[PDB]
Symmetry: C2
Subunit: 22 residues, 2 copies
């Protein structure tokens, strides 16, 4: 039931990381 | 603050979430 929301939360952090330099 | 620290902390929390998700699955 909250599977799609946790995947999206994970995806949003991935998007935040992609924009940052190492 | 620091960019290198933010990046590492985000990598770590993403991984903790991934493991919590794998455990729920």
């Amino acid at each position: 039931e909250x599977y799609k929301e946790x995947e999206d939360x994970q995806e949003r952090x991935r998007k935040x990381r992609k924009k940052x330099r190492s």
